[PDB]
Amino acid sequence: IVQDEILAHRLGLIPIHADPRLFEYRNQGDEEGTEIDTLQFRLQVRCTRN
Amino acid sequence: QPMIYICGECHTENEIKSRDPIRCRECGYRIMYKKRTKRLVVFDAR
Amino acid sequence: MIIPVRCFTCGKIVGNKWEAYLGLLQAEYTEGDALDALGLKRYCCRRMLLAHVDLIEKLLNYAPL
Amino acid sequence: APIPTVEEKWRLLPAFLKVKGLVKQHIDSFNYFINVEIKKIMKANEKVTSDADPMWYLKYLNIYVGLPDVEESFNVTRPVSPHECRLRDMTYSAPITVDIEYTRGSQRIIRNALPIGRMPIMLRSSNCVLTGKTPAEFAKLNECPLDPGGYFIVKGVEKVILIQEQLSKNRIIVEADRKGAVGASVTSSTHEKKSRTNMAVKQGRFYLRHNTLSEDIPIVIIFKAMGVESDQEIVQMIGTEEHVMAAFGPSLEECQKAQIFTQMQALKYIGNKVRRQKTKIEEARELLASTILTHVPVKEFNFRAKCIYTAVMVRRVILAQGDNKVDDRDYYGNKRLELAGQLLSLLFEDLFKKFNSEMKKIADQVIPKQRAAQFDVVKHMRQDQITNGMVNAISTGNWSLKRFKMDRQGVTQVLSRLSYISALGMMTRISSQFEKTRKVSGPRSLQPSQWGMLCPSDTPEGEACGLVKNLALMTHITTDMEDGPIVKLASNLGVEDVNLLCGEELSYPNVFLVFLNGNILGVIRDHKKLVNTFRLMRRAGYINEFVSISTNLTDRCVYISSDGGRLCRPYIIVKKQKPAVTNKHMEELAQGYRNFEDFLHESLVEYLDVNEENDCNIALYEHTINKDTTHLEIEPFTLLGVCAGLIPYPHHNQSPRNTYQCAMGKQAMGTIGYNQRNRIDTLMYLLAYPQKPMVKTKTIELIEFEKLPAGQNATVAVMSYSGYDIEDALVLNKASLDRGFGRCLVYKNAKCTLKRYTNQTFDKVMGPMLDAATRKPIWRHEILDADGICSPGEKVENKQVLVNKSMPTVTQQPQYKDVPITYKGATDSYIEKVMISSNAEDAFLIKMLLRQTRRPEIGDKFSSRHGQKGVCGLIVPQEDMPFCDSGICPDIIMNPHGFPSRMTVGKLIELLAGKAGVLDGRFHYGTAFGGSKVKDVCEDLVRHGYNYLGKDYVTSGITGEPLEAYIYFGPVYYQKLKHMVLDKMHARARGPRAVLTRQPTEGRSRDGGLRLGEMERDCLIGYGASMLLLERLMISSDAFEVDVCGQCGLLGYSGWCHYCKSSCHVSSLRIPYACKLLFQELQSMNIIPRLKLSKYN
Amino acid sequence: RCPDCGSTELVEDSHYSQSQLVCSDCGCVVTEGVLTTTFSDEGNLREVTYSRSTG
Amino acid sequence: LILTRLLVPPLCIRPSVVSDLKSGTNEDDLTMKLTEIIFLNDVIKKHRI
Ligand SMILES: [Zn+2]
Ligand SMILES: [Zn+2]
Ligand SMILES: [Zn+2]
Ligand SMILES: [Zn+2]
């Protein structure tokens, strides 16, 4: 029911315990991301009756 | 091509073709929504 | 609709202290002592938690499901 | 020794709201219409017959409305929820059926169930499916439990019938004319005819003017025509005062000038003055008996009551001819409020009369010549007549009643779904009868009669200021009574018959006239005893509590009002300096021993009308109660309406500020209801994280606004910063907007219809036109699914199709042309849902709900719940915001300079109360004429270690040095308005033009350009810029090149003059296209402009 | 088509509140501006059918 | 000053809208007035004959 944009905004505000000194700034563009300057978090939740 | 829809009260996946009377089995409601797409969509956290 | 994660003024994490606050509402604690025990010294987080209305369940009651 | 005060007295207010209040008025009116009034209307026209072929008739027995159903199924009814009617763009109505008996071939045939129409069912009514339901059952029906209801749903749109305001009927009005003559007027309106008759003193004598007379005739001639022929009796009826006779002398002299001395001569004179529609004498007598003064009834051609009435009118005119005691029209004691019930009753009566006339005409046309096959009405009972009439009258809003000659417009209006407060306030609106006919400024003013009845501050800012009003929080509208026991009690209370005595007793100082709805009930002596006994009998319960009684000592008239539409207000009865309501009664009410009806029955609280409260003494508080007190005010903050109740501490602010705050709250952004997600409207504004206010009024708790807030509480600091908040502007924090503050959602609707035409062809949706080069759909058809309909979840850009609609061009192979629904939008939109429905016409209705998530930026309008509307001037980062010792940075910085000119101390009080509340974890109250005091919040501040005045030590974030003056920090409930810069930003290229005049269009949605009005032309003339004006109004707007012939001066084409059949004198000329259109129109009007061209040298 | 090169790849694309025909190869327009009726006159204009306007 | 011929204006003053959504069109009031005038002329001629 929560909107997709509102969900993305709420997820963006969630802090990450990753050490920022071990990463680098992503260059202009490059939406695919590289191993050095990105992290991936998977969230898959399927609600069902008990 | 199997086109799928969702009723308004039972919320069951119903397959209907073109030029069919909009209805649903095991009920009589006439509000038929379309399921969400499967294509990838990119959102910005800004 | 739902409790925001960040505070508007400062930005302290407050979304994780909502349901627990509700627990403090299920207990005998009042509003002020509960907001004090949650660790909210500044009044901005107190306003964020106290003035928030829980409308997510009212919408889920109208959800398709 | 202070008088004891009942603290829980305000508890009388919610209990009343349990049976009456905001939305119960229209609900009760619609219930009375569909349960009682409709049966009376059916009984009034129960039998209808035709003149030809006698012994034939159609007799109605009983009419039912039933439950709301939908005719979607084939000849089958099915219960349908109002939300389904909103989705399917249909009407929410119930089938009106009736049982009848008729004669086909002289054999009486009876019908027990025959549908005749469809009546739209008001929501939350008696027959509505929403009543008697629990919030869980409301969720099962996709309806908000907090929805006020009371509005009709027609063709998918929500229409509300505003409360109409009009002048009271059957009342003498003494007013000055254009030339200063103080005359009288009476608009006698019965159930059949309405006639306004006037009386003037233009030439020292009283002339009576009516629409049925050729020329105004003297009043003495009418007196002689109405039975009384002696002049002495006429003078005694007019008055026995010396000035009265001195004023009436000229009339007697003018009457004696003519030879009119008997009733027959006067009737002959009137008949000679009667306009065409002894016969003249009979027509004059009929006009005097029935047409003139319809409200005054004559038993059997006995004009005694009418004679007394016109004599009292002449006496009032004579008394008003001296001291200027002219009655005012804006006095609300003489106003009447028509709800939706009376309007629907009149409309149903008119429609039923039209249906009966049509049936009688069809019978007269069919029965006498058709065949031996006996004609019956059932074969011609048109069921769509009443249905279409109701649907059109509710949707279009124009009401044309030819039987009453009533032509009204704007009766129904589209319900505003901007917010919950918007709809809750629009539901209790009241329009004026004037409807902006003239800037009188009289009715537009705030009259003292609106006390406790209508909200003083709540009024739309603009051209409709003063003509559109809102009801108070605690008010009620009365209905019509039987008027029988009133007459019985009046006759039994010693009121002597007016026919028993002459008019001379009307001139006595101690004899007081008693009236009844404008009709002379009689005379009485010692009216104090009469009024006291009537009030005591009404309190006892033998007389209806809504029957009002008033006394006018200036005119010495006792008015007894029992008609509907009058405004009444509950008041606690005070007897001998002590109110009847004590603490024990309030404790019993709180515990549930009694209700408001028990207070009404036990002579504790009674309803007072404006005319009745005009003579009574009301006390605001217990300490104000004196010896001469009759009633006590329940609660003062009930004076404000619904919107004005949102204002925290409104008695500390200015009245224009409160008006602007109400106007902006009617446009405030916020949640609508619990079913706002399934709701699909053409435009909806929602807030991401709505928060309830910290300083909430008791009215907010009454209307349950805290469950559906329309704003957010932000830490506002009142200071000047960077000079980007010069005039009403405000500075917003970048980090606050980044963390979700002010985030809003805009939901738009895109509807498409696939209907079947007369021919056996239908509109079909083609699949996505895949590009053969890449085997993928084109950029325009990218968002379309396999069925050609856009799927939810994707983003829509400009110039993209949502439904690939194609329609045939025939209405042998069908030829389909594409008419896709393209998305016009500057920014991208996301599809939330796509609903596909099917009506009875096999037309597929497809509704896409586009969603846009918008962030506050420069140009967004914000309010602060105090009329301090502002625009975001600059968005500074968090580090640039000042910080206190605790480290809190403000979200909104507002200009302090707006405080002195507007005197908004209520904003400071609300800020202090909110700060104290967020410090101690409480919710302070901003109740009008009360609430939390300043001392309490100051003690709360000093207890928690903060300053007792809100000002705190603040260090500047830019320079890092402390400020010389302390900054006023505190939580303020700011609300965002629907006025966005993104929707208001407009730019116009060359673009399209209009067909008639080749100029850009008007509206922004029509891709229109700006208009350089007359004032802009005046400014450009004053500047003297001739070339700029020429470029703007000629070159860039409607430039064109025409061909003018130098011989005849007419306009040619392609360098050729058809008039002279030559082309040597034809020359090109630059001209505005509007000028050429004007020249052509003038040539069409035989006004031929002959242009004599010449060289520019 | 294109007046200079002869390319027939003309595409209808909506400009900033402006409709025109332009070729995707040379970017040259062949017809710009469109004439549309206003709703101010639409409510004033009355309807005429073929049968009544033929007899 | 006494008219015997009526000047019907061009179509630029009388815009015509093709409403394909229904079985009809959109023509201004001047067209209807001229139609009524021609109808009255024809009726007068028929009564004279
Ligand atoms: Zn179903
Ligand atoms: Zn905080
Ligand atoms: Zn010429
Ligand atoms: Zn080219």
mmCIF file of C-alpha atoms in Angstrom, chain B residues 9-46:
data_model
loop_
_atom_site.group_PDB
_atom_site.id
_atom_site.type_symbol
_atom_site.label_atom_id
_atom_site.label_comp_id
_atom_site.label_asym_id
_atom_site.label_seq_id
_atom_site.Cartn_x
_atom_site.Cartn_y
_atom_site.Cartn_z
ATOM 1 C CA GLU B 9 -13.613 -8.302 -3.742
ATOM 2 C CA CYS B 10 -12.289 -11.854 -4.167
ATOM 3 C CA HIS B 11 -8.919 -10.707 -5.591
ATOM 4 C CA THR B 12 -8.466 -13.793 -7.780
ATOM 5 C CA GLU B 13 -6.447 -13.945 -11.000
ATOM 6 C CA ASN B 14 -8.982 -14.169 -13.842
ATOM 7 C CA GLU B 15 -8.049 -14.749 -17.492
ATOM 8 C CA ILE B 16 -10.418 -13.081 -19.971
ATOM 9 C CA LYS B 17 -9.960 -12.291 -23.662
ATOM 10 C CA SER B 18 -11.018 -9.306 -25.753
ATOM 11 C CA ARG B 19 -14.684 -8.292 -26.065
ATOM 12 C CA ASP B 20 -15.821 -10.192 -22.971
ATOM 13 C CA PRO B 21 -18.399 -9.062 -20.389
ATOM 14 C CA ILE B 22 -16.358 -7.810 -17.443
ATOM 15 C CA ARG B 23 -17.228 -10.219 -14.623
ATOM 16 C CA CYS B 24 -15.575 -12.628 -12.189
ATOM 17 C CA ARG B 25 -16.212 -16.214 -11.142
ATOM 18 C CA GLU B 26 -17.733 -17.181 -7.759
ATOM 19 C CA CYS B 27 -19.014 -13.585 -7.440
ATOM 20 C CA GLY B 28 -20.675 -10.791 -9.397
ATOM 21 C CA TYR B 29 -18.432 -7.774 -8.897
ATOM 22 C CA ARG B 30 -17.618 -5.726 -12.000
ATOM 23 C CA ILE B 31 -14.449 -3.852 -10.953
ATOM 24 C CA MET B 32 -11.402 -5.355 -12.678
ATOM 25 C CA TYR B 33 -7.918 -3.993 -12.012
ATOM 26 C CA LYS B 34 -4.769 -4.855 -13.957
ATOM 27 C CA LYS B 35 -1.861 -6.586 -12.244
ATOM 28 C CA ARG B 36 1.414 -4.745 -11.763
ATOM 29 C CA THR B 37 3.940 -5.004 -14.577
ATOM 30 C CA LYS B 38 6.980 -7.279 -14.480
ATOM 31 C CA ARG B 39 9.364 -4.778 -16.098
ATOM 32 C CA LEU B 40 12.221 -3.326 -14.070
ATOM 33 C CA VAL B 41 11.639 0.214 -12.785
ATOM 34 C CA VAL B 42 14.401 2.399 -11.321
ATOM 35 C CA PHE B 43 13.569 4.788 -8.474
ATOM 36 C CA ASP B 44 15.609 7.590 -6.913
ATOM 37 C CA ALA B 45 15.805 7.948 -3.132
ATOM 38 C CA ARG B 46 15.910 11.759 -3.446
#
